[PDB]
Design a protein around this ligand. Structure first.
Ligand SMILES: CCCCCCCCCCCCCCCCCC(=O)OC[C@H](COP(=O)([O-])OCC(O)COP(=O)([O-])OC[C@@H](COC(=O)CCCCCCCCCCCCCCCCC)OC(=O)CCCCCCCCCCCCCCCCC)OC(=O)CCCCCCCCCCCCCCCCC
Ligand SMILES: CCCCCCCCCCCCCCCCC[C@@H](O)O[C@H](CO[C@H](O)CCCCCCCCCCCCCCC)COP(=O)(O)OCC[N+](C)(C)C
Ligand SMILES: CCCCCCCC/C=C\CCCCCCCC(=O)OC[C@H](COP(=O)(O)OCCN)OC(=O)CCCCCCC/C=C\CCCCCCCC
Ligand SMILES: CCCCCCCC/C=C\CCCCCCCC(=O)O[C@H](COC(=O)CCCCCCC/C=C/CCCCCCCC)COP(=O)(O)OCCN
Ligand SMILES: *OP(=O)(O)OCC(C)(C)[C@@H](O)C(=O)NCCC(=O)NCCSC(=O)CCCCCCCCCCC
Lengths: 63, 175, 104, 128, 219, 84, 178, 55, 88, 70, 459, 124
């Protein structure tokens, strides 16, 4: 019971306040939350566009 | 978001890869994001919708103030105090606007450096070049004026720079 | 004040002072929180000589190791595209002198 | 025989290495006795003032007052302009000023000459 | 400059630690020498290795300090190793925790300190650097083994040298659990973290056999 | 809740110098015509559970036997499961 | 600490102080108990070989070479008891010591707690108030003229008397107050 | 949206609540050390999630 | 801490225990009030060693000015009690 | 939050079976982990790729001519 | 601007017609109300100024100084309530009258739009301070102290007056707006050099500049607590405000006339800081620390860059608050012990824990712990000085270290260690003293949230 | 290491300088001179954004290993074959560097021997 109230008042309420503040006020301005660009490897496909990155140059494999 | 102009603050198209699981083990990250969504994003969204509808019930506006152009210091008499006052205020407003332009370019550069990752040295050449040009122009306009800066001192600095440029051009042409 | 007797019943035990006794002109310089003059197991000159000798020897040896470095019996590391010309600084409108790497 | 300890200003002589404690004379014993006597008198005065139920105030220490007065207010009336004081005052109060003036003036002249010749590369130097 | 500063720091602090009698002083000088080793790693242009060493040192050095504090409390706030004798049997959990921590600090293979210290030593061995700094790093590794030996030998192996009123007691769940969590950390965290992070440097795949074993040999 | 249990001291006649390094110290001292008057005061440090020692190598290999047995069992199971 | 000091240390006191210091530093050098026992018996034998000597001059020539030899081999990091002036817990509990007179400044709502303690405290205060007036005169008549020669204090000699200057010794805070 | 930033800020933020409560009634009782210990354990568990996301 | 609150009886018992392990003095002859020089025929060096054994036994050091005038076991017990604030 | 253990006064202190078994278990765990890792990943200690002998390479592959051509 | 001036004037009849037992209550309440009213001056523009009339104008350099001046009066009344208990009603009313007249003179001086008007009020501030020091001071040195505080000041300011009237016979005006808009360069000439010296020395002597600072320790250690508060918090900043105003007509002479003072400051800040390491008086130590901080402000003003001016404004405000708090703490010790010697009352953390917390916060603020506005001003000044010359960092760096040392020294000597045994009259702290410290320290930490308010007109 | 002893205690000009290596034309030994082949292109190697020091001739194996690591996340020991492949490629790169060192050393030996023979013929 004490752990339940602790998790409600010390984790859930702060995360609610912080998520609201970030999602509706901080990101309302440009460049406030800047993400590192995700890595792209050959053979991947993009959700936004849907094209397929071509594979590599079939290097000679041995050992 | 429509809260800012996308051309003033450009961004790349943000192409992201697709999940390609290779094993049958369930990754904990997806489940954690689902429970995060259910426990955090929904109540926050509901509270936001309530607050937004309350704001829609009461809609009112504020405006950007427009400023007329007035004669600058280059067309004021020596002791005509009213014209110098107006020109000084206009010059100070222009100085603030130039500072904010430099700030915008610096924000572009910082965002590029963070976004590009390990290839920032090659992929942020345009932002670096833009910042170099704007910094050079700002340094030419406003550097070394002092704490007691004014439009007259800026005009004197520009006049001396133009005199030096004219002398150098005449010397190079008459080489 | 640190070399005063700690087993005496001073009126001010922390300062090791007695009420009414003459105070040294520089009491605030010696308050057990600051410079003390207590005798040491080794003489001051010997300590100075040993510390200075150790420091000077270490500096000289670091300079010697600077002149005589350590390395492995290898050639320089090779990088493919004109020594990564475009990825390191750039300037893609100058056509740098091509550097080609030797396959052995 | 063992290597000798050499005392210094910041590492004083041990009491067990003092020859003065091995040169015992009746006059030395009398001096020690009267030193203990005056210490005992001062201790008795302090302890009589300290254990008194009636007293409810900080006990005044003439030695502390003398120390603070000598450190602060007795300095100038005992000052005498001598070659040593004059020379030390001139050095310690004038030399640093001209030393720092020379250093800073040389640095700023070098920087100004570099700026005038245009070879300084002040790119991105916007705030000053 | 960073390389030379780190090398002289680690050598000097290990040398000072080798003759200390207060146990907390020994562990503090060990911490200083480890920091010097981190600066050596920075000097040879291996920052991610230095970060990894920071992460591993956290675990095992914190657990070592907790074991020392347990001994100090059990011996009536006594900190000198001259006055602690046979504790290997008298308080076994602290003994095992300190033994595992000393093995992790000295870079025992496949323990938490292995995955950082061994790689750092290999990287310093194969690099264009000062010969003096490399020699000082190796001597400092030897001295690390030496002062770990000193702590163990003077705190656990002899006959008791503490006052006759024996108040030794380990049986507190708080102490046991707090020490045990960092024990599990100092056993497995190096493996887990090293296998779960992306590669950030070119490895030293090929090496002379004597050069590959240098850290173990000097230890 | 504190330790008030009336601890009673052991018998002082129990402590004897025999069978300890203090005996060898006494023999060496008697070789010069001396004696150790405080010998029996330290005998408790070599008497009971303190009488047995462990080497440095033995200290390092504290749990090697059980760990080795578990490793043998685990590697045998790995062999018997992979070979299928 | 408790005992008043004298004007000087005699030769015997200096010799005994050297004996104690040398044994302690030898123990600091010899960590193990049996080694310490052996070398301490050897040091005792070395110490009393001149125990029976009669003349002062050479007996003072000894205990000087002894101090020099001690200072040469004095173990620069000797063992200190933790509460001793050099120990790791010398003044550790000095910040928990509060004077008794602070209790006079407590609020009445604070003194309402612990009524028995403050009743006993009032008893102690009245005892001190009478005893002081007796003690001042006792010390006045027991002192030689010209002032005290040694900072040693007399006991009480009458029946209802208390030892002069007893309050701040009897009402010490504690060794471990908190 | 992207719980990474929210989680990272929440760890540091909930590290500060016992400092705010240091003037409340819990600070005057003997349960305060356990309060701080529990808060730190919860913060560790929360911070374990962005590490998984980065991994 | 977790240190039991030692009492006067414990201090006396431990002092006598340490003294009975000093083979220079006969365990039958000594008592709480038995003097060191006159009752047991000991020396000043023996007294210094006895004080050192007391210090080792109780974990704290007695200053030399106080230690030099502790000539009976009873006064040793009293000194330890006054130093450590023992009620009963 | 532990149990009561009285002092002993010059005898070996009282020990619980729980702490003994826990300490032995953790020491055995450490040794088993070391043995398992050495059995499975031995190249982390002894290496995987042999070190070539530089003097054993023939002059043909090193581009060395018999001291007369150029 | 009269909405602040008229109530301050009405404080006098309110004080004199008050009941004998209600002077402090009424004075404190109405001073707090005047401070609340003056808070509205903080709404400044990026444009010229708040030119209310031909006589008074306000700037973002003047507004924080005015707010500090109006806020200091209730604190001074609270601090003076204690030691003036046994004083007759008429003399208490005279004391409050002196404080009110000082506040009025300061208010007008900051907002005056004319250099001559500014000079007159800048000198009018002397009479109340001199009366306060020499009448309600405690020791016999106060008389001498007063003399110093007077003549030094006058010795600097009589030439300035001459220069001022000379300027008005040449330019035709001493109005600051016209002076700024019609500024002309100063040619390198002996007459111009002496005009520069006349315009500068009066403000240098009141900062005070190193070598001209001998009056300050005397005045601050001999003044009553309210006098020390107003002297350290506001009267020192008059020289900084004057130099900030007057340097607009001194260019480009300042480019090379500033060298002797800059050195005198850059070395001076070292000396005074080192002086704080060996001091047996608390008030003397606090006064010397004030001298060091004001030397940094002098360097900032002489450098004449935007970052320099911002840092100087921020440091002036921060030092005012911090030094006032430190003087109040020292006085709260003195009223218990009556000695003013650092090593007499010791180990006070054991007897007064909350006052020890106040001591710690004040020492931390004087130590310039980030993100306090003390450190903001110090760092802006240091960056501007580094741009002026990269070598300056050395001296600046040294000062930083030394400052921390003596600050913590003052905290360790008085609060830590063992209590003095024979001092048995240390009573629990009153609500008045705790409220005084709280009202000193809360505005600083609030101001760190909106530093733009105290960064001056060049922000 | 022995090369340090050879260069620092023996003849310095007899051994290569690591900073200024190589000093001889690549075609000096044999005229074949086959070029080194790179597999990963500039664009995909930039998209994987490895590092400017990992962007070497073994980069394709690094890209494959990173793909394995990302794809099989919870099983952090799933893809060890590609780790072995990248390590082998780096091993071969190091062996090529060692061969370059040896070739330069032997060419220096031969050049000094030519100089000695020419000096002997000139003196005779
Ligand atoms: C850190 C986050 C905090 C978040 C929670 C909210 C914090 C509220 C703080 C309020 C402001 C300070 C109040 C000072 C007066 C205290 C009055 C008092 O007597 O209380 C007794 C009360 C009851 O105790 P008691 O039983 O009577 O005590 C008996 C004894 O007196 C024994 O007393 P004691 O031993 O308990 O002494 C009190 C205690 C604490 O007391 C203090 O020290 C107070 C002053 C501390 C700062 C000193 C100035 C430094 C410059 C600060 C400039 C920034 C200001 C920010 C805005 C502040 C607005 C007011 O002493 C200390 O612990 C030393 C503090 C050293 C702090 C060093 C680090 C400072 C900078 C930290 C970074 C801040 C910006 C981060 C930016 C980047 C990330 C966003 O105890 C308390 O209330 C203590 C409060 C806990 C300390 C708070 C320290 C953190 C807050 C700093 C300022 C606000 C920051 C806001 C952003 C946080 C993110
Ligand atoms: C005491 C505590 C500190 C108080 C505050 C001290 C600050 C005041 C210091 C005064 C600042 C300097 C005053 C004049 C500076 C001008 C530069 C000049 O002095 O240097 C050379 C001048 O050379 C010599 O200095 C000539 C004057 C020599 C006689 C002056 C006395 C020198 C020391 C006196 C110090 C006494 C100060 C205290 C008075 C009570 C330059 O050569 P030159 O190009 O030709 O002259 C340029 C000026 N022109 C263009 C107008 C012609
Ligand atoms: C630069 C510093 C210049 C010198 C500063 C002098 C400051 C004097 C005022 C300090 C107050 C006095 C004081 O602190 O007391 C001394 C106090 C007591 O000594 P303990 O040994 O701790 O005694 C405790 C047991 N009894 O000791 C101290 O804290 C003083 C420390 C002073 C350090 C001075 C030496 C620093 C030299 C730096 C050289 C290294 C340069 C950087 C190298 C890195 C390379 C990039
Ligand atoms: C804390 C004590 C400080 C004491 C004050 C120090 C500052 C002294 C400044 C000089 C004093 C006089 C200032 C003059 C007022 C300005 C007016 C002016 O500049 O006009 C000048 C006049 O300048 C002078 O005449 C000044 C001459 C100096 C006479 C007084 C000497 C005072 C002492 C001088 C040396 C000390 C100055 C620095 C002191 C440093 C601090 C101790 C031009 O005159 P015209 O003839 O009309 O124009 C020339 C073309 N026809
Ligand atoms: O009966 P007591 O009152 O106990 O008197 C004891 C004694 C008689 C021995 C003594 O007090 C005394 O009065 N002696 C008279 C002569 C005398 O003592 N002369 C001086 C002898 S000096 C000496 O004993 C030699 C010292 C040798 C030890 C050197 C210590 C070096 C140790 C180095 C560190 C480990």
């Amino acid at each position: 019971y004490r752990h339940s109230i602790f998790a409600v008042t010390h984790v859930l309420i702060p995360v609610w306040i912080i998520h609201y503040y970030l999602k509706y006020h901080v990101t309302a301005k440009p460049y406030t939350v800047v993400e590192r660009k995700p890595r792209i490897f050959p053979g991947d496909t993009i959700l936004e566009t849907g094209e397929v990155i071509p594979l590599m140059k079939e290097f000679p494999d041995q050992h | 978001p429509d809260s800012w102009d996308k051309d003033v603050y450009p961004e790349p198209p943000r192409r992201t890869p697709a999940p390609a699981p290779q094993t049958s083990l369930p990754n904990p990250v997806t489940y954690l994001t689902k429970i995060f969504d259910l426990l955090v994003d929904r109540p926050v969204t509901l509270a936001r919708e309530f607050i937004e509808q309350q704001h829609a019930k009461n809609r009112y506006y504020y405006y950007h103030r427009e400023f007329r152009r007035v004669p600058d210091i280059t067309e004021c008499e020596e002791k005509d105090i009213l014209c110098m006052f107006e020109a000084e205020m206009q010059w100070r407003r222009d100085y603030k606007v130039d500072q904010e332009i430099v700030n915008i370019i610096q924000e572009r550069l910082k965002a590029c450096q963070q976004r590009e990752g390990e290839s920032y040295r090659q992929n942020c050449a345009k932002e670096l070049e833009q910042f170099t040009q704007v910094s050079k122009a700002f340094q030419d306009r406003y550097s070394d004026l002092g704490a007691h800066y004014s439009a007259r001192k800026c005009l004197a600095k520009q006049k001396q720079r133009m005199l030096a440029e004219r002398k150098a051009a005449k010397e190079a042409a008459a080489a | 004040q640190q070399e005063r007797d700690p087993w005496y019943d001073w009126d001010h035990p922390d300062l090791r002072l007695n009420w009414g006794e003459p105070i040294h002109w520089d009491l605030d310089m010696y308050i057990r929180n600051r410079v003390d003059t207590s005798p040491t197991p080794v003489s001051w000159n010997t300590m100075c000589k040993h510390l200075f000798g150790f420091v000077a020897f270490m500096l000289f040896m670091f300079w010697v190791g600077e002149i005589y470095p350590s390395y492995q019996p290898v050639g320089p590391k090779q990088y493919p595209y004109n020594d990564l010309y475009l990825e390191r600084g750039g300037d893609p409108t100058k056509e740098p002198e091509p550097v080609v790497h030797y396959e052995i | 025989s063992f290597p000798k300890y050499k005392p210094s200003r910041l590492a004083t002589l041990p009491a067990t290495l003092d020859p003065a404690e091995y040169d015992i004379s009746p006059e030395t014993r009398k001096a020690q006795a009267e030193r203990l006597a005056i210490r005992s008198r001062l201790k008795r005065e302090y302890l009589l003032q300290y254990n008194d139920p009636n007293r409810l105030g900080v006990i005044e220490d003439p030695a502390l007052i003398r120390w603070t007065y000598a450190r602060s207010a007795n300095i100038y009336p005992n000052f005498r302009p001598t070659p040593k004081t004059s020379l030390l005052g001139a050095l310690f109060g004038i030399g640093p000023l001209f030393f720092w003036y020379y250093v800073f003036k040389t640095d700023r002249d070098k920087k100004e000459k570099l700026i005038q010749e245009g070879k300084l590369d002040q790119t991105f130097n916007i705030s000053y | 400059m960073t390389l030379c500063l780190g090398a002289i720091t680690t050598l000097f602090t290990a040398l000072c630690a080798i003759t200390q009698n207060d146990i907390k002083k020994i562990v503090a000088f060990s911490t200083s020498s480890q920091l010097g080793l981190m600066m050596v790693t920075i000097g040879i242009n291996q920052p991610h290795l230095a970060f990894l060493h920071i992460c591993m040192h956290a675990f095992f050095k914190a657990m070592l300090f907790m074991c020392s504090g347990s001994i100090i409390h059990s011996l009536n706030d006594e900190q000198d190793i001259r006055k602690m004798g046979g504790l290997y049997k008298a308080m076994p959990f602290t003994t095992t925790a300190l033994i595992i921590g000393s093995l992790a600090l000295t870079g025992m293979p496949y323990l938490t300190g292995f995955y950082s210290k061994d790689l750092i030593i290999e990287a310093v061995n194969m690099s264009y650097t000062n010969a003096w700094a490399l020699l000082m790093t190796l001597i400092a590794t030897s001295l690390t083994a030496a002062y770990s030996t000193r702590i163990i030998f003077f705190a656990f192996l002899g006959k008791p040298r503490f006052p006759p009123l024996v108040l030794i007691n380990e049986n507190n769940p708080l102490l046991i659990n707090s020490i045990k969590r960092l024990l599990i950390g100092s056993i497995f965290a190096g493996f887990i973290i090293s296998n779960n992070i992306p590669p950030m440097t070119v490895p030293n795949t090929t090496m002379p056999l004597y050069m590959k074993m240098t850290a173990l040999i000097v230890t | 809740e504190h330790g008030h249990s009336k601890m009673e001291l052991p018998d002082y006649k129990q402590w004897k110098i025999e069978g300890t390094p203090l005996e060898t110290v006494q023999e060496k001292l008697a070789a010069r015509g001396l004696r150790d008057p405080w010998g029996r005061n330290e005998a408790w440090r070599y008497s009971g559970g303190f009488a047995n020692n462990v080497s440095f190598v033995g200290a390092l290999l504290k749990g090697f036997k059980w760990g080795f047995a578990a490793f043998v069992v685990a590697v045998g199971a790995e062999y018997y499961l992979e070979s299928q | 600490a408790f005992s008043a000091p004298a004007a000087y240390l005699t030769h015997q006191q200096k010799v005994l102080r050297l004996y104690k210091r040398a044994l302690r530093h030898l123990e600091s050098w010899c960590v193990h108990r049996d080694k310490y026992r052996y070398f301490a018996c050897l040091m005792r034998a070395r110490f009393d070989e001149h125990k029976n000597e009669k003349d002062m001059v050479k007996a003072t020539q000894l205990l000087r070479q002894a101090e020099e030899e001690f200072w040469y081999g004095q173990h620069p990091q000797p063992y200190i008891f933790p509460e001793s002036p050099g120990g790791t817990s010398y003044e550790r509990y000095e910040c928990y010591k509060v004077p008794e007179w602070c209790l006079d400044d407590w609020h009445p709502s604070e003194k309402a707690m612990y009524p028995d303690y403050f009743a006993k405290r009032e008893q102690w205060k009245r005892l001190r108030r009478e005893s002081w007036e007796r003690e001042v005169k006792q010390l006045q008549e027991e002192t030689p003229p010209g002032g005290p020669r040694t900072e040693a204090l007399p006991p009480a000699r009458k029946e209802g008397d208390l030892p002069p200057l007893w309050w701040h010794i009897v009402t010490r805070p504690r060794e471990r107050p908190m | 949206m992207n719980p990474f930033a929210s989680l990272t800020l929440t760890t540091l933020t909930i590290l500060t609540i016992p400092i705010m409560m240091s003037n409340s009634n819990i600070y005057k009782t003997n349960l305060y050390p356990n309060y701080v210990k529990t808060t730190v354990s919860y913060a560790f568990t929360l911070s374990l999630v962005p590490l998984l996301m980065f991994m | 801490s977790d240190a039991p609150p030692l009492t006067l009886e414990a201090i006396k018992d431990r002092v006598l225990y340490v003294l009975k392990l000093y083979d220079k003095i006969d365990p039958e002859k000594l008592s709480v009030n038995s003097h060191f020089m006159k009752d047991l025929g000991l020396d000043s060096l023996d007294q210094v060693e006895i004080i050192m054994a007391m210090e080792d036994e109780f974990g704290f050091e007695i200053p030399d000015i106080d230690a030099e005038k502790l000539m009976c076991p009873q006064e040793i017990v009293d000194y330890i009690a006054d130093k450590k604030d023992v009620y009963e | 939050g532990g149990v009561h253990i009285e002092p002993r006064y010059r005898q070996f202190p009282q020990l619980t079976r729980s702490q003994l078994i826990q300490a032995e278990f953790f020491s055995a765990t450490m040794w088993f982990w070391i043995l398992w890792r050495f059995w499975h990943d031995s190249d982390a200690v002894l290496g995987h790729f042999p070190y070539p002998d530089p003097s054993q390479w023939t002059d043909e592959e090193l581009g060395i001519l018999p001291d007369d051509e150029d | 601007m009269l909405k602040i001036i008229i109530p301050t004037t009405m404080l006098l009849p309110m004080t004199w017609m008050s009941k004998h037992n209600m002077i402090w209550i009424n004075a404190t309440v109405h001073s707090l109300l005047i401070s609340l009213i003056s808070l509205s001056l903080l709404n400044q523009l990026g444009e010229n100024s708040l030119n209310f009339s031909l006589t008074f104008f306000s700037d973002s350099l003047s507004a924080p100084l005015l707010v500090l001046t109006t806020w200091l009066l209730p604190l001074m009344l609270m601090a003076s309530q204690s030691h003036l208990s046994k004083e007759t009603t008429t003399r208490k009313k005279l004391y409050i009258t002196m404080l009110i007249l000082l506040q009025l003179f300061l208010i007008m001086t900051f907002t005056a739009t004319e250099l001559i008007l500014f000079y007159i009020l800048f000198e009018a501030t002397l009479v109340p301070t001199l009366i306060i020091i020499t009448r309600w001071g405690n020791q016999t040195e106060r008389l001498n102290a007063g003399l110093y505080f007077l003549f030094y000041t006058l010795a600097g300011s009589l030439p300035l007056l001459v220069a001022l009237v000379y300027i008005q016979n040449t330019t035709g005006s001493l109005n600051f707006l016209i002076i700024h808009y019609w500024s002309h360069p100063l040619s390198n000439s002996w007459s111009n050099i002496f005009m520069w010296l006349a315009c500068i020395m009066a403000f240098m002597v009141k900062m005070p500049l190193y070598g001209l600072h001998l009056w300050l320790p005397k005045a601050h250690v001999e003044a009553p607590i309210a006098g020390s508060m107003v002297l350290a918090a506001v009267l020192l900043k008059l020289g900084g405000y004057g130099m900030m105003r007057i340097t607009t007509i001194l260019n480009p002479l300042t480019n090379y006339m500033a060298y002797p003072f800059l050195m005198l400051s850059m070395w001076g800040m070292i000396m005074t800081s080192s002086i704080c390491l060996r001091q047996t008086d608390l008030k003397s130590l606090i006064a010397y620390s004030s001298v060091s901080h004001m030397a940094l402000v002098i360097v900032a003003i002489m450098i004449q860059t935007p970052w320099s001016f911002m840092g100087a404004t921020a440091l002036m405000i921060a030092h005012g608050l911090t030094s006032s708090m430190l003087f109040c703490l020292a006085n709260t010790n003195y009223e218990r012990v009556h000695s003013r010697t650092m090593i007499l009352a010791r180990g006070l953390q054991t007897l007064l824990p909350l006052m020890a917390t106040w001591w710690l916060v004040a020492s931390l603020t004087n130590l310039a712990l980030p993100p306090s506005i003390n450190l903001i001003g110090e760092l802006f000044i240091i960056t501007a000085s580094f741009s002026w010359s990269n070598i300056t960092i050395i001296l600046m760096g040294m000062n930083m270290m030394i400052t921390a040392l003596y600050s913590l020294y003052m905290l360790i000597t008085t609060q830590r260690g063992k209590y003095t045994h024979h001092i048995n009259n240390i009573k629990p702290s009153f609500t008045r003293e705790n409220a005084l410290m709280a009202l000193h320290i809360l505005p600083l930490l609030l101001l760190t949230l909106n530093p733009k308010m105290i960064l001056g007109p060049l922000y | 290491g022995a090369h340090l002893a050879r260069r620092y205690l023996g003849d310095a000009s007899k051994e290569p300088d690591p900073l200024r290596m190589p000093t001889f034309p690549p075609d000096y030994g044999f005229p074949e001179r086959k070029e080194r082949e790179m597999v990963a292109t500039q664009q995909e190697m930039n998209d994987a954004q490895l590092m400017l020091q990992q962007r070497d001739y073994c980069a394709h194996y690094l890209i494959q290993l990173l793909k394995c690591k990302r794809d099989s996340f919870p099983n952090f020991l799933a893809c060890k074959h590609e780790q072995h492949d990248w390590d082998y490629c780096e091993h071969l790169d190091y062996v090529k560097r060692m061969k370059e060192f040896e070739r330069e050393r032997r060419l220096l030996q031969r050049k000094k021997r030519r100089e000695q023979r020419e000096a002997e013929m000139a003196r005779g």
